[PDB]
Amino acid sequence: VRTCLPCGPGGKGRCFGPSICCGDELGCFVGTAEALRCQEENYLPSPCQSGQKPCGSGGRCAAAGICCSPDGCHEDPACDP
Amino acid sequence: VRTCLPCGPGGKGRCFGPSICCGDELGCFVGTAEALRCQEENYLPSPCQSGQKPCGSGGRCAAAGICCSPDGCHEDPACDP
Ligand SMILES: N[C@@H](Cc1ccccc1)C(=O)N[C@@H](Cc1ccc(O)cc1)C(=O)O
Ligand SMILES: N[C@@H](Cc1ccccc1)C(=O)N[C@@H](Cc1ccc(O)cc1)C(=O)O
């Protein structure tokens, strides 16, 4: 399905959840201003998914060494470059 | 227990982990530039702690509706304002 809405500095990030914005060259913003646009995805009737590698439980590698699901992120070696 | 080092915009955040910086009016920065300063804590001989309310597994409320441990953060109603 489509990648979720872009977000963050220079739009270089992508939403991984309502309040989670991440990018390989940015790290992850959780609940910060950078992730506010990510709540808008809730209004879009089509499914979206960001990232490429599955990790944790229902999560995906969102940034260097970081795994995120729609409600949280945690450091994960499997997600390291 | 001393509070961990300050970090983030206007120094309004506090470190919850080597690469996690959170603040009540900021949200949480996970692996972003804002959290680089938090690596210094690793070399301070005294233990530190941020937040006042325990949550999830070994985490503490770091921001409105967010629970963080030194390894990550997740949405948690128990942390709502
Ligand atoms: N567009 C939303 C809602 C939706 C979910 C499933 C099917 C159709 C619509 C969406 O895709 N939400 C994601 C989760 C998510 C991801 C990013 C974000 O900024 C907010 C939520 C999903 O459930 O797959
Ligand atoms: N000061 C560090 C290391 C230390 C731990 C225990 C006793 C003495 C020193 C520290 O307190 N680390 C925290 C975790 C942490 C928090 C913020 C941060 O920027 C980096 C690490 C701990 O282990 O409690």
Side-chain angles (χ1 to χ4, degrees):
Chain A
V1 304
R2 70 180 168 82
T3 303
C4 303
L5 293 173
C7 57
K12 299 181 176 65
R14 296 293 182 280
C15 298
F16 279 69
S19 59
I20 302 174
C21 177
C22 312
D24 291 306
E25 313 186 321
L26 295 169
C28 286
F29 301 93
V30 182
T32 72
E34 284 84 2
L36 289 171
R37 182 152 66 212
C38 296
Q39 306 191 82
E40 303 307 292
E41 184 61 62
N42 289 169
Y43 300 105
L44 308 188
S46 64
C48 77
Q49 183 171 63
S50 298
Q52 296 174 57
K53 180 192 286 191
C55 55
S57 180
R60 296 173 75 70
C61 292
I66 303 175
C67 177
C68 307
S69 71
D71 75 309
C73 301
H74 67 70
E75 300 185 327
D76 193 324
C79 288
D80 289 299
Chain B
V1 195
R2 169 177 63 81
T3 290
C4 304
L5 294 173
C7 55
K12 302 299 177 178
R14 293 293 180 284
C15 297
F16 279 72
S19 62
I20 299 174
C21 177
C22 309
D24 288 303
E25 42 194 303
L26 305 174
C28 284
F29 299 94
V30 183
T32 68
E34 288 82 2
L36 289 172
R37 171 55 153 47
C38 296
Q39 288 180 44
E40 176 161 53
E41 187 58 57
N42 280 156
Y43 297 89
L44 295 183
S46 71
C48 73
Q49 183 170 64
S50 298
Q52 292 87 181
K53 180 176 182 172
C55 52
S57 180
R60 281 211 154 191
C61 293
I66 305 172
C67 178
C68 302
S69 74
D71 310 349
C73 306
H74 66 284
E75 305 184 309
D76 187 346
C79 290
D80 279 315

